[PDB]
Amino acid sequence: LMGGFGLKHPPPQILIKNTPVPADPRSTFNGDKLNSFITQYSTGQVSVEIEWELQKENSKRWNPEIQYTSNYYKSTSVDFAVNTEGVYSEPRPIGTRYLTRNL
Amino acid sequence: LMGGFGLKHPPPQILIKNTPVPADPRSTFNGDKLNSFITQYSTGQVSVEIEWELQKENSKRWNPEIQYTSNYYKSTSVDFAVNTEGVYSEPRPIGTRYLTRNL
Numbered sequence: 001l002m003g004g005f006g007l008k009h010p011p012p013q014i015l016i017k018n019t020p021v022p023a024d025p026r027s028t029f030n031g032d033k034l035n036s037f038i039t040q041y042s043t044g045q046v047s048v049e050i051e052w053e054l055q056k057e058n059s060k061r062w063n064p065e066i067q068y069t070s071n072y073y074k075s076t077s078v079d080f081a082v083n084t085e086g087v088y089s090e091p092r093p094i095g096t097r098y099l100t101r102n103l
Numbered sequence: 104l105m106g107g108f109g110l111k112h113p114p115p116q117i118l119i120k121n122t123p124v125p126a127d128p129r130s131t132f133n134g135d136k137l138n139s140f141i142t143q144y145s146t147g148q149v150s151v152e153i154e155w156e157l158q159k160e161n162s163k164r165w166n167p168e169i170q171y172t173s174n175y176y177k178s179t180s181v182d183f184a185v186n187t188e189g190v191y192s193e194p195r196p197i198g199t200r201y202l203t204r205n206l
Contacts, residue, residue, distance in 0.1 A: 062183065062184070063173065063181055063182060063183040064171070064172070064182070065172070065173060066172055066173050067170040067173075068167070068170065068172075069167070069171075070166065070168060070169050072169060079167070080165065
């Protein structure tokens with residue numbers, strides 16, 4: 001109901017964790033669990049690639065369609081770009097429905 | 104200079120004419136040319152088919168382009184259609200230059 005593709009078997013969820021590294025323990029045995037660790041974090045790269053299938057539009061409409069376009073007039077900044085501070089923003093929401101079809 | 108493709112050998116020009124059909128002449132020979140004809144005209148069908156080669160656009164521009172689009176707002180008639188009297192009109196001239204490229 002938020003929109004999308006419903007899936008019985010959606011793309012699986014991917015879990016990631018840092019392995020705990022203990023700090024130096026006591027030199028005499030204690031049976032309690034170890035609560036003292038070295039502080040860590042990790043960084044890296046992630047890639048994702050999706051193949052999409054397209055359904056081409058085949059239409060005998062004579063007159064031109066409605067299209068999504070960018071504003072022609074001058075502006076202080078470009079839409080869908082960074083500003084002076086280096087912040088990327090998205091000006092408006094963009095839907096999918098422009099071309100037409102007979103009911 | 105009006106714009107277009109210059110051609111040393113352009114598509115050839117096609118000439119068409121009704122063949123003259125004489126009206127009944129005199130029953131005694133005269134050597135002057137015949138100036139009296141039957142009035143005629145012709146109608147028919149014509150087809151023309153052109154193959155066009157396309158140059159695809161390959162671009163890394165991040166932000167959206169300018170596109171030619173039709174007006175969204177309500178109107179008394181549709182652009183590029185017939186009116187109530189059956190007259191077809193073209194509202195505006197439409198150029199070819201919308202997508203962009205680096206200089």
